[PDB]
Amino acid sequence: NLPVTVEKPIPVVYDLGNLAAFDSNVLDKNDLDSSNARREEKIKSLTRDNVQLLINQLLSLPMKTTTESVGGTGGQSSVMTLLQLPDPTTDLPREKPLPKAKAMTKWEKFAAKKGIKPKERAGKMIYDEASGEWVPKWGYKGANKKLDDQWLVEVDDKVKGTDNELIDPRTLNRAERKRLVKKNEKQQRRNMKN
Amino acid sequence: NARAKRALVKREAKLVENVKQALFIPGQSCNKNLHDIMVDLSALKKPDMKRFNRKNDIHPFEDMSPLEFFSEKNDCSLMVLMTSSKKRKNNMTFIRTFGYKIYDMIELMVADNFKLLSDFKKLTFTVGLKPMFTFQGAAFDTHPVYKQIKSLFLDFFRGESTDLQDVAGLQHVISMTIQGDFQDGEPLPNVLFRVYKLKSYKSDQGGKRLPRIELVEIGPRLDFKIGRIHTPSPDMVTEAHKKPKQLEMKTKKNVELDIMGDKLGRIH
């Protein structure tokens, strides 16, 4: 029945978040040098005392219990009792710097100046009055590409008198959409540059 | 393409960083002792370890660009370069990098009286559980070199951070002890690195809540002599020790949150 009460001159400090213990007591070079054959015993005894103190602190930490069963999300079962580790005290350098805040774009500055609050983004579904169905407003089977599949398109009077009359209006609208998309891409690239 | 985007997002910086990964790089000259020590350290580090196999002409204190290139290519913030020389026998260089640039480097030499993992032939711990740490020596808190050693080893073997710990996972402890107290103007004492496995028994004096602890040595046992050092710049130290402070609630005077979750204000 060996005791679990370790008496130390210098009090050991604990970082329970990292499960680490630090003792700054006096270490003798004679008992730890390679010339002494009891160095392993000395190191094992000191480490045993430090680990005993660390385990005492860990078992004195507060404990979390739950009532949920196995097979559920969370990873903790009712029979499992966990320790609540505090935040680590030791400060260590990060592997990467903190992410810098992105500079405000031209649109963001304009919206802030004009008091334009952002849209609510409820969803991508809009009601088609010509039919009785809800359709996406963009993307896969979006409503913005219905003119390409439209069976009959009236030719505009403004296109008359130009050489572009013989072109399919569906092709012209696809070209205009691609031009708008490329303009948006160019504006994004410009915002990245600035 | 979406897999590539996911990899890039995983590699990019974040408020809560991932577990630091360690790359083990052999040098131009390597030995079987170095290979076995590297294997044992990689076993202690896994599954946060990547190992190269070929020989690499790397001199950290003459150039840094190959190390920086490897760190950026592999997303490994920890580097262990193993080399040999007549002046430096069994040299392990630990390079910790901040932002794909050399943050700090230490260079230790392994003494000859070392025993590998297979010498002990004892039952060991399950793969992938965080260890406990013990550090013996006031120089860990006072001397800058041992400050760097303690920070490097805690960062290297800390693993995944968590707020909840299962008691069945507390299996092994890494002990780093200074070979006796020293004074100014003396050679730096070697650092002794040991690994122990825990055993518990009824104590009959601390009740049924405090068991008597015992240790069984696992290995490897290593003695590191401090050959070379390379410290970071103060501004780099500050930039690496900056805190995000975004996730936590801002503290406001006379405003508290009670147990029910109501926001309460104090008047005087």
Next chain:
Amino acid sequence: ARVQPDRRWFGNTRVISQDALQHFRSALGETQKDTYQVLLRRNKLPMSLLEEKDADESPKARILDTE
């Protein structure tokens, strides 16, 4: 004025776990009100579930069921 079909209308909006229920139930009763603390914002909780007090006596039985 239209409402689009969506599966978000039929999902649960608020749930509470048994551990959270027990924590708030034990906290309700241990509060020590301070006269110099004011209520800045009330937490949103299922108070009908959380407000259960042990009563020494039961209400009278409804006699119109039997007679």
Next chain:
Amino acid sequence: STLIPPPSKKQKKEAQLPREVAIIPKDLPNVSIKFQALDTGDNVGGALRVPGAISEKQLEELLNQLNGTSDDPVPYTFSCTKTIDITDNLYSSLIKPGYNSTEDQITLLYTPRAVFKVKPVTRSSSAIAGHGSTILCSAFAPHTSSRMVTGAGDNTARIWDCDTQTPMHTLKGHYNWVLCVSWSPDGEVIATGSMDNTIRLWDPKSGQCLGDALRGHSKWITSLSWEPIHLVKPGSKPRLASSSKDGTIKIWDTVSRVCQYTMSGHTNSVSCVKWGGQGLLYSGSHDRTVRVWDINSQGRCINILKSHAHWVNHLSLSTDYALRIGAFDHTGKKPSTPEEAQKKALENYEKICKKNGNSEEMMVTASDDYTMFLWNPLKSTKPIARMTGHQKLVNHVAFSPDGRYIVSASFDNSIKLWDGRDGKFISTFRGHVASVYQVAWSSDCRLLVSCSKDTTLKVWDVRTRKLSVDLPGHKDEVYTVDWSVDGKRVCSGGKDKMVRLWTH
């Protein structure tokens, strides 16, 4: 999901502060204690001085040595009078909180406990199909935990093997809903009382029907009870008492497959009938009365107890677990001879019946007037106690297997724990969000299981008086639940037409 508030910065700093260690002092002085029994109030040794670091096991050995029974010790628990139980040691239980000083004496009440332990059920073993309609009733075999009988609304019962979680037999004799199922206390015959005013007897080993059905009731069967083995003469089979909606309790002798007595004193539907260990029968009915009949007096009504203002829904006896278990135990041992079976049943009954001087058999009745009444019908006609506090009707009531506690499951989404002797209120089990239908104890009287309308089961620890584990999984309301005799499995069933088996 709603979360508890996070800890504050000061609380995180306090967490990062080093923790105190609760270690046993070495200079702890001796403590004077006085032993006393909970049931009898008998003092052992007067004031005796013990070390302050005395452990529970060492204190138990000291009590055994005082009593002179060290050769065959019996595990006990200790409480101290605010009553606090002894968890690990005297210092941490009482001295460390500082409620009692070292100079003052400590009065320790000792209470016997079970040698074995039941682990709580924490997961579902299986979800077995087979029934065509909603599951109405369930029961376990008394001799073994591998046989479960379940009666449902598809006019059938099923015998399930619990080792492989597969159906073993189908019982398809009845024409209407199988309202109640029961197992013989010797484990030989399963009795099923149905909606068509009939009772059928089945051999479970062959899954077969013994002769024709028992007939004579005009309305559906409400409850079934068996004659206790310790009262049945050796070489004879126990008789079957049945209550029904028509207001009559019929007694059937299965040896000749006939009916002996038809008690007809009730003016309304009889809710439940229970056959006690002293040759008496207790019937609770919708006419707000409880009738006490004698089997030895040609089925004559000895007493009429009238204290409720509404229908008495359920009743339970102190020795009900012993009467249900018969001669078997938690180890599943089978007596070789009827004489040995009768003697073992008598001993099992007496260990609960005769204590604290005179043998008593307390009864508890839970009614629709939101209340319960605790009676001792042998000695007195007035009720011993009244248990109040439920805001809705008390649907179910159960004595603990040792008879020391009463648990009441009500329609106000609550369970209540009361003392089994004087009926004083102890605690409330909360956590169900719908009405609790029925409840069941474990064998060692330390764990409780309850099924509710909220499609969930809940297992509660009696000692800590808190919820242990919540068990979801059923798709609809759970109507029946039961715990095995050895405390290894829990069966449940309801509107989802699936039998849920749960294990540790």
Next chain:
Amino acid sequence: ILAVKKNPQSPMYTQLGVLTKGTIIEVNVSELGMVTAGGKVVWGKYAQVTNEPDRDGCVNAVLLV
């Protein structure tokens, strides 16, 4: 009532909290005793208003299940 999720007439009316016919609201369903598959107690759900409270003096809604 816990919140006004969607007034079909206009998002301006939604953020003003107008209660007309067809409005999606959030209601407290604690007394209904709903439990999920994972054992969580449901205490908030969605409902649609089916009447004109300005006409009949009360709010009637149907729970969306």
Next chain:
Amino acid sequence: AKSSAYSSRFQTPFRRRREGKTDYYQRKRLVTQHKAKYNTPKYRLVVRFTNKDIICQIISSTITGDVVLAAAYSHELPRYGITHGLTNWAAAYATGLLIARRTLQKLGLDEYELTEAVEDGPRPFKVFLDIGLQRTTTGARVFGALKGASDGGLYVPHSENRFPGWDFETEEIDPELLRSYIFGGHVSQYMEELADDDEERFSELFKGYLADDIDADSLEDIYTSAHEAIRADPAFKPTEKKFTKEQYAAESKKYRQTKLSKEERAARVA
């Protein structure tokens, strides 16, 4: 005509990958990947099938090579009363039941660790099914072993859509057909069908049953008795060793080829 450049630039895989018996993609996710970061140790219920034996083991991965906690084989079944069909679905079920009961008996869960200092009662033992390089098909013997272990009392997380009797149309199982496969009803049905249709096939197959005079209706009884015997006595009794280690080593080394010395090789060359 593979070149020296190809041989030099060749990159050999792992040893277990070369002699393909281990899926490292499955192994890394089974070992190094954790649902939560609470550092809970993991265990694998490894199930393997040879042409004549069923191997069930409980294995914990370790940094020095994994360690087996308990094991069970189909050749232990003659002790409990199973002598025929040692690799069928019922045999796999019995082996899973045996390893579950043996592990529970060894751990003492059903009739001083650091967890005992914090929690009152022991946890159920959780193992994850490991199948190696096997196909996931409905009605597999490895899932039969999984079902046997689950009924024995080990907490093995699993769904029930790969058991026999699982309907593909409706997400439900046939527990009667599951019981038939547990107690070998398919084998008995094949035996009866062979006896009714083709007597020569019934003479060729199931010759051991005829030699031991085992009727097709006794399969359920012998499987039930085997399950009862396994539950009653799940301890591991090793086979009696007729000879000793030195005798085995010497008699094997007598046939195993001895090495020839380098001087002898040089003398042979010269």
Next chain:
Amino acid sequence: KAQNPMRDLKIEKLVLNISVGESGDRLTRASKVLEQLSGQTPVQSKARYTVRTFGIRRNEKIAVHVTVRGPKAEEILERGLKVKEYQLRDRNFSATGNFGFGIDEHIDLGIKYDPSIGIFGMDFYVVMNRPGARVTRRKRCKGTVGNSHKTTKEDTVSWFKQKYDADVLDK
């Protein structure tokens, strides 16, 4: 080792291949006659390239084939050999002990001709191997066949000579 019963050469598979070139009704008729021949549904082949000369687009249907294993394969092989009147060239055999031959008309096999069917030919290809050849095809513990165990052209020619007693023509 020659007396060991596991070195016997047997039929692994008989593949009947019909490359029609153009997808459509003729391919459908080829599939139908292959089904009526072998008792099994044929399987189509997707295009691997796009050639204007061959009239083939990208990812289209060009050929069908049937694999037959067992006594049905033996019966179809004996029908093919009866049509080919027991005469095979030396170059018909490959270096790996597998041999094929083309039949111009399926009507010679004994199939009743139909006006809608038309005329179709097919390539017979027979694969020979010894027992133990599943080491290269099994999922677990895949290994190579031994040097002495591999089927060779002379060995399969000797097996054919012993089996069908049909001469192998040098030219």
Next chain:
RNA sequence: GGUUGCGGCCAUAUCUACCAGAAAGCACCGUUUCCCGUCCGAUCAACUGUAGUUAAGCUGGUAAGAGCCUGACCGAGUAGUGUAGUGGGUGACCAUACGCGAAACUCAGGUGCUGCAAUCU
């Protein structure tokens, strides 16, 4: 000492050609009613170890084979590389004190070590 299951180190383990392997195991091999999947029970799935074989799978040995690997008190503290005492020299450049520091080449050698569990004439 042989072998089987799960592995660590991932060529001392790989590639090509012969020989040996008593017992056990492994494997080839027999069959298609049930679960399952294919054009094809060829792989996958299931049943019997019943009919046989160690011909292959697998292990060991052999080859001045290819490939690969380990020690050097072997090159060598060398080439190379960075400062410097006012070291000379109006000159392209050179020994020196202190740091950092290779490979080609040569000698000596080699063709798997090991953890857990079970089994063997």
Next chain:
RNA sequence: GAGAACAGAAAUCUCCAGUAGAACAAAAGGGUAAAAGCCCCCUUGAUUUUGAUUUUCAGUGUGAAUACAAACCAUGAAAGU
């Protein structure tokens, strides 16, 4: 590299060898081979909704965007993703 009617240098099938020399993204000085490549099965939810938390918009700030987290969701026998 060998074999098979049209069918040849390129159409279709079979055997052996085949470290990737093919095809995906990046510009590795060590990316991926029981795959990160090709094919098949399931999911059309991906602009879910809760938050006393971070940041920003007032005359409509218990609202909306925004960051993070959680509960869910999909799939898989499962580990897990």
